[PDB]
Design a protein around this ligand. Sequence first.
Ligand SMILES: *[C@@H]1O[C@H](CO)[C@@H](O[C@@H]2O[C@H](CO)[C@@H](O[C@H]3O[C@H](CO)[C@@H](O)[C@H](O)[C@@H]3O)[C@H](O)[C@H]2NC(C)=O)[C@H](O)[C@H]1NC(C)=O
Ligand SMILES: *[C@@H]1O[C@H](CO)[C@@H](O[C@@H]2O[C@H](CO)[C@@H](O[C@H]3O[C@H](CO)[C@@H](O)[C@H](O)[C@@H]3O)[C@H](O)[C@H]2NC(C)=O)[C@H](O)[C@H]1NC(C)=O
Ligand SMILES: *[C@@H]1O[C@H](CO)[C@@H](O[C@@H]2O[C@H](CO)[C@@H](O[C@H]3O[C@H](CO)[C@@H](O)[C@H](O)[C@@H]3O)[C@H](O)[C@H]2NC(C)=O)[C@H](O)[C@H]1NC(C)=O
Ligand SMILES: *[C@@H]1O[C@H](CO[C@@H]2O[C@@H](C)[C@@H](O)[C@@H](O)[C@@H]2O)[C@@H](O[C@@H]2O[C@H](CO)[C@@H](O)[C@H](O)[C@H]2NC(C)=O)[C@H](O)[C@H]1NC(C)=O
Ligand SMILES: *[C@@H]1O[C@H](CO[C@@H]2O[C@@H](C)[C@@H](O)[C@@H](O)[C@@H]2O)[C@@H](O[C@@H]2O[C@H](CO)[C@@H](O)[C@H](O)[C@H]2NC(C)=O)[C@H](O)[C@H]1NC(C)=O
Ligand SMILES: *[C@@H]1O[C@H](CO)[C@@H](O[C@@H]2O[C@H](CO)[C@@H](O)[C@H](O)[C@H]2NC(C)=O)[C@H](O)[C@H]1NC(C)=O
Ligand SMILES: *[C@@H]1O[C@H](CO)[C@@H](O[C@@H]2O[C@H](CO)[C@@H](O)[C@H](O)[C@H]2NC(C)=O)[C@H](O)[C@H]1NC(C)=O
Ligand SMILES: *[C@@H]1O[C@H](CO)[C@@H](O)[C@H](O)[C@H]1NC(C)=O
Ligand SMILES: *[C@@H]1O[C@H](CO)[C@@H](O)[C@H](O)[C@H]1NC(C)=O
Ligand SMILES: *[C@@H]1O[C@H](CO)[C@@H](O)[C@H](O)[C@H]1NC(C)=O
Ligand SMILES: *[C@@H]1O[C@H](CO)[C@@H](O)[C@H](O)[C@H]1NC(C)=O
Lengths: 269, 133, 35, 98, 96
Amino acid sequence: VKQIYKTPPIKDFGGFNFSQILPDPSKPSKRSFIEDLLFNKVAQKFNGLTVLPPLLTDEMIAQYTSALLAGTITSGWTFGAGAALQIPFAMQMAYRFNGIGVTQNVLYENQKLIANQFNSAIGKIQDSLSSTASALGKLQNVVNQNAQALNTLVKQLSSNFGAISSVLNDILSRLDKVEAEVQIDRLITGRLQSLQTYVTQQLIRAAEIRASANLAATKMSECVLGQSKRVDFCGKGYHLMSFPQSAPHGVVFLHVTYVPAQEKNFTTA
Amino acid sequence: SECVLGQSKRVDFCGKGYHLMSFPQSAPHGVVFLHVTYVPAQEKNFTTAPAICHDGKAHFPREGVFVSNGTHWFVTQRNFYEPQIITTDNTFVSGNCDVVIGIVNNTVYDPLQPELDSFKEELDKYFKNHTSP
Amino acid sequence: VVIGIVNNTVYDPLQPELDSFKEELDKYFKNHTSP
Amino acid sequence: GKIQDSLSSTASALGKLQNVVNQNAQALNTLVKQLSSNFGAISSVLNDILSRLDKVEAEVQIDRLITGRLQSLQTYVTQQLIRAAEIRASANLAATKM
Amino acid sequence: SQSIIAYTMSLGAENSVAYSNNSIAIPTNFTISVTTEILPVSMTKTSVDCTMYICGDSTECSNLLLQYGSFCTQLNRALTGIAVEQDKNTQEVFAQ
Ligand SMILES: *[C@@H]1O[C@H](CO)[C@@H](O[C@@H]2O[C@H](CO)[C@@H](O[C@H]3O[C@H](CO)[C@@H](O)[C@H](O)[C@@H]3O)[C@H](O)[C@H]2NC(C)=O)[C@H](O)[C@H]1NC(C)=O
Ligand SMILES: *[C@@H]1O[C@H](CO)[C@@H](O[C@@H]2O[C@H](CO)[C@@H](O[C@H]3O[C@H](CO)[C@@H](O)[C@H](O)[C@@H]3O)[C@H](O)[C@H]2NC(C)=O)[C@H](O)[C@H]1NC(C)=O
Ligand SMILES: *[C@@H]1O[C@H](CO)[C@@H](O[C@@H]2O[C@H](CO)[C@@H](O[C@H]3O[C@H](CO)[C@@H](O)[C@H](O)[C@@H]3O)[C@H](O)[C@H]2NC(C)=O)[C@H](O)[C@H]1NC(C)=O
Ligand SMILES: *[C@@H]1O[C@H](CO[C@@H]2O[C@@H](C)[C@@H](O)[C@@H](O)[C@@H]2O)[C@@H](O[C@@H]2O[C@H](CO)[C@@H](O)[C@H](O)[C@H]2NC(C)=O)[C@H](O)[C@H]1NC(C)=O
Ligand SMILES: *[C@@H]1O[C@H](CO[C@@H]2O[C@@H](C)[C@@H](O)[C@@H](O)[C@@H]2O)[C@@H](O[C@@H]2O[C@H](CO)[C@@H](O)[C@H](O)[C@H]2NC(C)=O)[C@H](O)[C@H]1NC(C)=O
Ligand SMILES: *[C@@H]1O[C@H](CO)[C@@H](O[C@@H]2O[C@H](CO)[C@@H](O)[C@H](O)[C@H]2NC(C)=O)[C@H](O)[C@H]1NC(C)=O
Ligand SMILES: *[C@@H]1O[C@H](CO)[C@@H](O[C@@H]2O[C@H](CO)[C@@H](O)[C@H](O)[C@H]2NC(C)=O)[C@H](O)[C@H]1NC(C)=O
Ligand SMILES: *[C@@H]1O[C@H](CO)[C@@H](O)[C@H](O)[C@H]1NC(C)=O
Ligand SMILES: *[C@@H]1O[C@H](CO)[C@@H](O)[C@H](O)[C@H]1NC(C)=O
Ligand SMILES: *[C@@H]1O[C@H](CO)[C@@H](O)[C@H](O)[C@H]1NC(C)=O
Ligand SMILES: *[C@@H]1O[C@H](CO)[C@@H](O)[C@H](O)[C@H]1NC(C)=O
């Protein structure tokens, strides 16, 4: 989005309650109630590693999340294409249902119930994220493999690789210029080779995230900025729309999917 | 395929906005697309009504949304302002007033009624014309 | 040609408008019997 | 009906899968074949190095195998991950296709 | 006059949408614009003879290398695969 939108002061959504997903002014970081679970759920060391802080910090990332959420709830899908054009939320669903081949009359004839159903459904993920521990495995995994690699990478410093010690200073302390030449020569190979494997390990995983981000960006542009007729690409079921929600080193969607309830058989010609 | 060999409904895939067509042009070790996108430019505020009641029965826009310039209600395509007179062949009936939230009152012109009105006057006048013989 | 086709009437919404005028026209000619 | 016969008539229909199993098979043989390479040592038999040289320097020659035989293993797994990511890209494509 | 300045980056110009329960916006005019998109399709082919590189034109070096197993033929096979995939990429993209 090239225009950071801000939520309107009023919450006149015709019964729809977006309190959980809009940012809470109480928190000094302008993040919403949902990611409070997520954020809670999930300096050069002498070893030589560092950590570069992301250019987009958590606050601004969360601010982007609010902007992406504001256009969807107020301008519909239009703000993806060009200028944002406000449309009240009731007629937004009236066209998303029209997208799935369901006449818009059903929404107005069932406005309150679906609004209650949607808000109750929004309540479910609130408990489901809190009650379940492994629901956030993907983000926890990506952090873990990155974390264990460095721990494995650091632990490599103590392997002799055939040298008489793993303290390069000790090798200098006990051997002369020529004797320590041999030991350091062997020692650096293993340090370099282990570093070689780590970097090659880094690229493969980094390529996986790049596809994931490209998958996320496509989901961002298709699930959120519009309605995607690509079945089972945006949630299990007929798609209506979705909400991004930030998370540490990841993104989380909230797909709102239409799914038929109890059915009746009939005779047809 | 989805941009050149056809039009893609995937928003923000074949260029920024509603995609129309893409012209490929070769390049050293690469390709460069020219995505032709439809981007609305000039917008305006309007008054909207989710639906329309006519005689207790409710009405909904078949294609487009109900809009009003303050005095008269119209229906126009959601991506281009082209107001249309609210007519029966532009809407479909469903339910009634008591259910739809935000519905407003306005009459919907059945195109058949005024056409038959001229026949009614011709019918009435011939009965008066039939008094003389 | 359709396999599985069954029988039913297809209602014409044009008819009630003409039925309304057909019945209305009946009394107008009946009234003209007075002169 | 033509699919059944056309598939059963030509041998190039399943080139992709036959290539996939071949690549994973071919890499394994290279991994196994590298065991018989001396890698700059005196002999490629692990036991024969022990049975011909005293322990003062027998570790030196087998060390070359250790640096060597592992090196091929490191390359094979590196080839695998490159292939592992490639399949998942196809698998994810297949996922959408399904 | 000019100097190096560091600042909190602007995420964009704020715009509060005029949302209301019955306020709608419909476009009266459009602009049929065109934007360019750029995607690499293939890199330069490359074949590196393992022996010509590491033991270039040296019989003794080649003989010493032959002890190192099938490393060089593995690399040659990988690079030939890279080249054939370059042709495959170009063929698939431009042979629709
Ligand atoms: C909202 O849209 C309405 C429909 O386009 C429009 O109503 C139309 O207004 C024009 C004048 O602007 C009328 O034109 C008439 O103008 C004089 C006025 O005395 C007449 O003598 C002429 O014969 C001519 O008919 C249209 O008749 C009128 N149409 C309808 C259906 O009402 C409103 O003016 C628009 N209002 C705003 C605020 O934009
Ligand atoms: C849309 O039009 C409707 C009818 O044109 C209108 O409903 C009408 O509302 C009036 C105002 O109350 C009613 O008049 C009587 O209402 C009660 C009895 O229900 C009496 O106590 C009042 O004193 C008054 O005499 C009409 O009976 C009622 N008619 C119908 C068919 O509902 C709606 O209010 C209009 N709504 C909008 C949004 O314009
Ligand atoms: C739907 O209703 C149709 C109208 O009744 C019907 O068509 C009619 O079918 C009957 C018998 O199937 C025909 O009657 C003739 O049938 C044979 C000759 O075809 C003779 O042995 C009979 O004595 C008699 O002459 C009607 O001629 C025929 N009429 C028309 C207009 O088609 C359909 O069959 C019905 N459809 C189904 C699925 O039942
Ligand atoms: C709709 O009906 C089908 C079967 O049709 C029924 O057949 C006769 C018994 C007669 O009563 C018809 O009018 C019925 O419509 C149902 O399929 C059956 O489902 C039950 C489970 O309740 C199962 O035990 C049966 O084996 C099924 N029939 C067959 C032939 O396998 C179907 O479930 C009905 N739909 C719903 C929503 O109940
Ligand atoms: C359409 O109107 C809105 C505001 O509604 C107006 O409110 C009164 C001023 C009166 O004129 C009513 O008849 C209107 O319906 C505009 O939103 C305003 O935009 C300006 C930008 O110039 C901004 O400073 C205000 O804060 C906005 N007000 C609100 C309540 O959001 C909107 O811009 C108008 N549409 C166009 C295309 O200009
Ligand atoms: C949207 O739902 C939330 C969650 O229930 C509502 O917040 C609650 O409001 C009640 C009203 O008194 C309080 O008792 C609860 O303590 C609130 N929950 C929390 C976690 O504090 C919110 O009011 C709803 N908003 C709308 C507009 O429906
Ligand atoms: C929509 O915008 C286009 C250009 O942005 C307008 O075309 C211009 O119209 C003016 C007068 O209407 C002319 O003087 C210009 O020469 C036109 N431009 C070009 C390139 O031809 C068009 O009029 C606008 N339409 C509406 C309804 O606002
Ligand atoms: C919109 O909200 C305002 C105040 O929030 C209210 O006065 C008005 O009746 C509402 N309109 C509809 C159609 O509900
Ligand atoms: C009246 O009827 C006569 C014949 O029935 C016809 O010639 C004449 O044109 C009619 N005039 C009018 C005004 O209908
Ligand atoms: C459907 O199948 C039944 C057999 O169970 C058969 O009797 C019937 O004719 C079939 N329907 C049609 C339209 O032929
Ligand atoms: C015939 O029509 C006249 C009006 O022109 C009316 O006064 C009269 O009652 C009608 N006759 C009958 C029998 O209804």
